[PDB]
Design an enzyme around this catalytic site. Structure first.
Site, PDB file in Angstrom:
ATOM      1  N   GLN A   1       1.085  -6.238   2.872  1.00 37.09           N
ATOM      2  CA  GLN A   1       1.552  -6.363   1.501  1.00 37.09           C
ATOM      3  C   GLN A   1       0.524  -5.951   0.485  1.00 37.09           C
ATOM      4  OE1 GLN A   1       1.007  -9.970  -0.598  1.00 37.09           O
ATOM      5  NE2 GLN A   1       3.195 -10.290  -1.020  1.00 37.09           N
TER       6      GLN A   1
ATOM      7  N   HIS B   1      -1.674  -2.973  -4.906  1.00 38.40           N
ATOM      8  CA  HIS B   1      -0.524  -2.404  -4.220  1.00 38.40           C
ATOM      9  C   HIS B   1      -0.549  -0.897  -4.237  1.00 38.40           C
ATOM     10  CE1 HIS B   1       1.321  -6.306  -3.640  1.00 38.40           C
ATOM     11  NE2 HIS B   1       1.246  -6.577  -4.952  1.00 38.40           N
TER      12      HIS B   1
ATOM     13  N   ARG C   1      -7.645 -13.996  -0.964  1.00 34.55           N
ATOM     14  CA  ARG C   1      -6.945 -12.847  -1.555  1.00 34.55           C
ATOM     15  C   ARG C   1      -7.401 -12.659  -2.999  1.00 34.55           C
ATOM     16  NH1 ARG C   1      -1.894 -11.586  -4.146  1.00 34.55           N
ATOM     17  NH2 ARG C   1      -0.504 -10.105  -3.038  1.00 34.55           N
TER      18      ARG C   1
ATOM     19  N   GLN D   1       1.755 -12.973 -10.334  1.00 34.69           N
ATOM     20  CA  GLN D   1       0.912 -12.628 -11.491  1.00 34.69           C
ATOM     21  C   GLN D   1       1.736 -12.390 -12.740  1.00 34.69           C
ATOM     22  OE1 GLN D   1      -2.568  -9.644 -11.103  1.00 34.69           O
ATOM     23  NE2 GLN D   1      -0.837  -8.403 -11.540  1.00 34.69           N
TER      24      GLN D   1
ATOM     25  N   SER E   1       4.697 -10.694  -4.641  1.00 38.13           N
ATOM     26  CA  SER E   1       3.247 -10.585  -4.497  1.00 38.13           C
ATOM     27  C   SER E   1       2.679 -11.952  -4.126  1.00 38.13           C
ATOM     28  CB  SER E   1       2.612 -10.081  -5.793  1.00 38.13           C
ATOM     29  OG  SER E   1       1.412  -9.373  -5.532  1.00 38.13           O
ATOM     30  N   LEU E   2       1.781 -12.495  -4.947  1.00 39.74           N
ATOM     31  CA  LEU E   2       1.306 -13.871  -4.684  1.00 39.74           C
ATOM     32  C   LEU E   2       2.416 -14.787  -4.278  1.00 39.74           C
ATOM     33  CD1 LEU E   2       1.026 -16.883  -6.103  1.00 39.74           C
ATOM     34  CD2 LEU E   2      -0.883 -15.974  -4.678  1.00 39.74           C
TER      35      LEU E   2
HETATM   36 CL   LIG Z   1      -2.895 -12.772  -9.843  1.00 39.63          CL
END
Ligand SMILES: [Cl-]
Ligand SMILES: [Br-]
Ligand SMILES: [Br-]
Ligand SMILES: [Cl-]
Length: 288
Positions: free
Chosen positions: A241, A193, A112, A9, A87-88
């Site tokens: 995660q 998160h 997600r 992101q 992340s992603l």
């Molecule tokens: Cl995102």
């Protein structure tokens, strides 16, 4: 040794992936069939600002990072020794390590992004100037007890996450601390998160049991543990995660401990490269 790192992101950008969609028409086709819309037009034309809505950002970055990787290994005829992603981006590390096939990864990131697009009444902020332990001690000292550490990104770059009112109070508290030079609000409306993602993580975990995973062919350094994925724990670690901190600095420090380690950011932008530069320079400084 070489590690490939894949961004998440904030690294999306109209024009991302230009040239790649036509060069990988088989995979572009496969993505459009799953998504129900043209991935190329989302990326190159950004209709209705959709690139900055997570339900679309996550497929967009996953597809561009995947085709970037396939182009890079085909043109250079080499594979990396290790992979990781933020992340992603960890889905693109897992795709490079053959933990799942291109289509499978896209269905996971679509789900997600749908789950995360429904989260509201949260916020996240990037605090600059304190290390992880100093932010944890401050949340305790100053009674910011409903705020979590969501990312540990560079030696003095920590992201906090929680409900919107509590994050605005916490940001303002951090702005009064001696070593804090900036607190930047992130472009999100969920407490990602953090403990507020526990229900989304339970839903996503159950969802993953329908899909098919294979043992990685390249070690994938996980955001939850900053150590390689193991096969029997792959679905639990990927779900974990969502409600745990991204331990980016410990992931990169575990790779640097191996010796001569090169890092290449694969996908749009240079965000991870900038974090890695600060982790390397900090590692060259002694205590006092
Ligand atoms: Cl995102
Ligand atoms: Br193209
Ligand atoms: Br830093
Ligand atoms: Cl694991």
């Amino acid at each position: 040794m070489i590690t490939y790192v894949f961004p998440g992101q904030g690294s999306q950008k109209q024009g991302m992936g230009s040239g790649l969609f036509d060069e990988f028409k088989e995979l572009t086709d496969q993505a459009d069939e799953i998504l129900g819309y043209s991935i190329k037009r989302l990326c190159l034309e950004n209709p209705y600002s959709n690139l900055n809505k997570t339900q679309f950002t996550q497929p967009a970055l996953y597809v561009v990072n995947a085709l970037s990787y396939l182009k890079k290994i085909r043109d250079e005829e080499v594979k990396p020794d290790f992979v990781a992603g933020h992340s992603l981006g960890e889905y693109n590390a897992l795709f490079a390590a053959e933990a799942f096939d291109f289509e499978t990864g896209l269905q996971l990131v679509r789900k997600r992004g749908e789950l995360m697009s429904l989260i509201s009444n949260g916020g996240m902020a990037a605090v600059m100037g304190l290390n992880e332990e100093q932010v944890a001690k401050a949340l305790k000292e100053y009674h910011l007890h409903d705020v979590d550490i969501a990312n540990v990104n560079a030696p003095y770059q920590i992201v906090i996450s929680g409900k919107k009112d509590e994050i605005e109070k916490a940001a303002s508290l951090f702005e009064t601390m001696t070593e804090v030079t900036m607190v930047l609000p992130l472009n999100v409306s969920g407490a990602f998160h953090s403990r507020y993602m526990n229900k989304a993580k339970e839903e996503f975990e159950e969802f993953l049991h329908a899909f098919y995973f294979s043992p990685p062919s390249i070690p994938v350094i996980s955001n939850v543990y900053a150590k390689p994925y193991t096969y029997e724990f792959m679905k639990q670690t990927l779900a974990d995660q969502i409600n745990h901190s991204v331990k980016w600095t410990d992931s990169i420090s575990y790779l640097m401990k191996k010796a001569a380690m090169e890092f290449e950011e694969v996908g749009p932008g240079n965000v991870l490269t900038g974090l890695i530069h600060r982790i390397k320079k900090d590692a060259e400084a002694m205590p006092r």
